[PDB]
Design a protein around this ligand. Sequence first.
Ligand SMILES: Cc1ncc(C[n+]2c([C@](O)(CO)[C@@H](O)[C@H](O)COP(=O)(O)O)sc(CCOP(=O)(O)OP(=O)(O)O)c2C)c(N)n1
Ligand SMILES: Cc1ncc(C[n+]2c([C@](O)(CO)[C@@H](O)[C@H](O)COP(=O)(O)O)sc(CCOP(=O)(O)OP(=O)(O)O)c2C)c(N)n1
Ligand code: MG
Ligand code: MG
Ligand code: NA
Ligand code: NA
Lengths: 621, 621
Amino acid sequence: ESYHKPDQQKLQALKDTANRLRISSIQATTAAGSGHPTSCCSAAEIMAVLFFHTMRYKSQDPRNPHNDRFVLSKGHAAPILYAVWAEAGFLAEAELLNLRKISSDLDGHPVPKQAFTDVATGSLGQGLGAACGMAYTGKYFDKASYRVYCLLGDGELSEGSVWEAMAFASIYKLDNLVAILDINRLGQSDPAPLQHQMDIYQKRCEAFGWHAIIVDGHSVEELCKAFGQAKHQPTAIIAKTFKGRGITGVEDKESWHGKPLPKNMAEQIIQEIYSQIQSKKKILATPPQEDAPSVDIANIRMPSLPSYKVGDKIATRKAYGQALAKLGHASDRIIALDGDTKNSTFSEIFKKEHPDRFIECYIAEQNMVSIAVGCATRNRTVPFCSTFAAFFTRAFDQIRMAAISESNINLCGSHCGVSIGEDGPSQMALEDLAMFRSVPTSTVFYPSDGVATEKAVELAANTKGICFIRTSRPENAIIYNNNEDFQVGQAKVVLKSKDDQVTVIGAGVTLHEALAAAELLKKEKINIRVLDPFTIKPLDRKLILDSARATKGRILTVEDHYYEGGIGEAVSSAVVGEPGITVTHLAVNRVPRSGKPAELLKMFGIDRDAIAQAVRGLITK
Amino acid sequence: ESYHKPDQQKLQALKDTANRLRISSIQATTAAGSGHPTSCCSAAEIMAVLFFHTMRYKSQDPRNPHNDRFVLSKGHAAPILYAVWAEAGFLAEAELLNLRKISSDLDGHPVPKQAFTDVATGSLGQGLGAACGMAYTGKYFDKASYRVYCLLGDGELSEGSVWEAMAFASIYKLDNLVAILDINRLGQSDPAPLQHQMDIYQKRCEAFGWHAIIVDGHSVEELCKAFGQAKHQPTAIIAKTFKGRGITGVEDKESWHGKPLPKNMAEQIIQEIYSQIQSKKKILATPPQEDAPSVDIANIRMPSLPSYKVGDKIATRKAYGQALAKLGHASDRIIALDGDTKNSTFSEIFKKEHPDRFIECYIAEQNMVSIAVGCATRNRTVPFCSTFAAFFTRAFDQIRMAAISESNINLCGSHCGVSIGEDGPSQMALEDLAMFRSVPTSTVFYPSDGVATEKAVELAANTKGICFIRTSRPENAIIYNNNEDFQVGQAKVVLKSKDDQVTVIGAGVTLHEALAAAELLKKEKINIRVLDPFTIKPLDRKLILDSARATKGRILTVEDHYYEGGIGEAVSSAVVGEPGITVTHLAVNRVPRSGKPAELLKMFGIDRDAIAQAVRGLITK
Ligand SMILES: Cc1ncc(C[n+]2c([C@](O)(CO)[C@@H](O)[C@H](O)COP(=O)(O)O)sc(CCOP(=O)(O)OP(=O)(O)O)c2C)c(N)n1
Ligand SMILES: Cc1ncc(C[n+]2c([C@](O)(CO)[C@@H](O)[C@H](O)COP(=O)(O)O)sc(CCOP(=O)(O)OP(=O)(O)O)c2C)c(N)n1
Ligand SMILES: [Mg+2]
Ligand SMILES: [Mg+2]
Ligand code: NA
Ligand code: NA
């Protein structure tokens, strides 16, 4: 479709639109008594041109799969996003004045309870990565005509996650992606480092493989023209703007970030702005080409039961890769992402079988999570991203924001605990249960053998929210029949007798250490009940207490994790006050060190001998 | 001091050194059965030239404050670091063969139990930020002649944290810093994105303000020359290398990252390499100019007691800034860092009073933490870094690695919980207690008024490990006398009577809600004991149980945090099994939303009315 070169009337209408957007941003934030009108005002021409000249979308159906995508990475400009959607006719204009109220959904930063919002972006520097996932999906998966536009602040460009996204987009040739940089000179508490050194922004963007265009960000004509030419690269529109543009005496000034105008001032400024508006008549949105495919929404089922033999040995990290590849044969919706760790996590098995649905994200965990979030938007794909669980700590803010975004992504973190052995603590995940349990939409799977791992992958695929699967480096025996039924929130008793003296709860390597401890103790005529949680969150509280009532009220938890936030604390929190119920914990008490897996389990007090000694001390207490 | 231009004999000795380093890296990793010899071999000439021509250091005193610093950012090249320190005469050569053993300190990645290691770097992309802190300290604080050298991998350069550090170094004119990029074409599981496109690396470095020099990374002469010229910019030595250099048939090949040579192969390769060595005679290290100043090690004490009046109102975020500024008058060792949030966290007060000791880190939380770690190395400074607690999640891997680095840094995170109100959940820290409690060297302060905040700052300054202070946005009454004694691990009973029916544990805003609940309940002739933990980690278990025994065994915890990993779980874990002891929790059950602070405390069930209802239900249970 050809560029429609605007006439003066259309340009004036875009100017009028921009000024209406300024007025609304001021009105809403003054009414609220909080917000960021000066951050809205620098972006007003950009927003007017994108929404009312460049982009193609259904104004009454913002989530429509054919629409261009817009990502407001500088999320504190939310009032101007709300204003554009009122201008487009989707929101009632009166509702804008209810910004930030508990009675409204026009919250302080954008969130997906709003139909026009796909991802939450209030933590700066994350929007471009989500936009990259949307664009990758558009070009390679949907193979559709929609474009993706992402508006960033200049201070925001200090976040390294932005530059990971920059690099991703040029690696993957995202010529359907446009980044708009609101170079308004100022951050929150000082000028942004580069201020109005436009040439340095351009050099940085070009060095990272983008086509970079410097524009006057307050010229609707320059913006129309720059937006109106597609490229064969991701394109950066580097817009020179003034913070607080159009607010006399505030434009280009410090001390105004995140400060609303007092009511007397708002009135005077609004009259000034209003005097610039030539017509009240609004521009209409233009709809998209409807070429996005149908996506099925059905449950995804493994093509057959697991085919692992009891007593065979496999690491759960390898079972993960096998299971993911298997599920990829059952649904084309499954995609896999990994951060240069595919030979360690075994996501390489998926890549071998389904290369078109594997996304190499390189050593860039923050961006990987954001790509996954973007790919999951509008239910276009079912992403599984993997790395070492330790390195998911690099992406905690992206994971946190993924829950605020109501995202359905699946994360598999390998190499948990000290049982990795010789690499040492940098590679050892000892805080990942704490981290993922604190994510409010999470389900935490901790499979203890290959069968449980395959079942966890299948369950995760069909579970909403942030699903985490904790996998382990060493090989462990298969203990479950292939036809064992597994469910979220259902634990398994893997050893029991009628005279059990303690219920021992372990998972992964510590489940297997608990089973070996049981063999040790049998020597001593002491029996223990052994329970495998399967999911750490939610925890099968009923089976845990039923078990504990069978074993004199005594529970012992043993985990390859630090004491805080893990299995022991989950169990304690679930059962505290239950009469005759006691909980004793074994976990890792400090930063570990290198050695063989068995040696470290011993050093840190979570192997078979430690468990046996804790059981004896309970019995003799 | 002039460059000493090496003769052919010196160049040959550097070549011989490089080849000795290759042999040792192979021997050690073959002996261990794990490790990364091909990642060592690409760096062997770089390491030989740095250690035996360019840098100045005391070989027998690696921690000496006058020494040049070396940071191995690509930490999996640890065997070659160990080999250089054996070559320099500090380590016994036999010990190299004990790599990765539980009987050795030559662990899989470098760690500060090694005298020659300042920061742990096994999580890629963090070393350059630590190096920036070291260089900033050298140039601006110590005002000393030492230089800082940081070796990075090429895959590693995909981490956004690297680019934050790149930008920091050019902002702050770190002309005493050199980054060496080991452009060996390959990452772990595939070629690095840019492969041997040296010109693109150069353009990226130059765009970020560095002086960039492309060299043959296997030419000792080119390396000597490039290292031998100081600049007025941070300098990037962009070294074209081959992975596995010198290992015939492995050099430049895929499928060899992190794979040791089998013993038969090692023998053949080592003989080949050894045949290239012209002399066994080793080069000696050259010592530094001794111009680093003396740093005192004494306790740091506030110059006076707090001067806050009971019943006055102040937010703990503002008390933090006031307290930090005050302590800065007592010791020149205190430095402050903030990520473009100084007007929100009130670290601006410190900046006003002590501008030379404030480091603006911009919107780059990962790098901020790494700068702090680097500044704290060798005890040169006592850093306090601040941002919103929510945004510390962006830096969790840096914090995790800071504990592995045995670092003494202080972190103050503001804007905790839903009590911030209108910005919404992107800004609300609801997982920070979970996160910081999981850091094994942490102390977690949660001050409930301005007096407690000042005492927490003072205590943190004098406490080893990762200290976290959780501050709050809204103003709250001062409840403590200025002369109240505070200690790590000591809680306070702030309300008690002889007929108390429940012990209510709150902190920050929920302490004040618990006190208002107590006033509500008094109406009903119900008294409650109210306990302020002060530190969440370590928790005053004794006072909590003594309190609970006075209140019919009943504890109620109330927190502006998610359920997992916070105060309620800490308390439960501490007291589970204690007879007649029950714990009931109130916390935030899901992602919040915008509204007034009081409205959100109500919506999420953690305000005075929620507490009063939970107390009544205990009593009537
Ligand atoms: C990852 C990260 N780090 C820091 C910040 C903080 N911050 C912003 C806000 O969080 C808004 O999103 C902040 O203004 C709060 O509302 C302040 O709360 P108070 O309680 O103090 O009122 S916005 C921002 C600066 C961004 O500058 P630019 O990128 O240049 O954008 P522009 O406004 O100039 O267009 C900072 C530092 C966040 N949010 N995320
Ligand atoms: C933040 C982050 N993300 C990923 C990685 C993984 N990784 C490395 C190692 O972690 C070593 O530090 C990895 O090799 C493990 O030892 C493998 O464990 P196994 O159990 O599978 O044996 S190293 C690395 C690739 C780095 O490439 P370059 O930067 O190019 O360096 P070079 O080797 O070519 O010189 C990756 C992805 C870590 N560690 N950190
Ligand atoms: Mg700005
Ligand atoms: Mg490499
Ligand atoms: Na899922
Ligand atoms: Na401290």
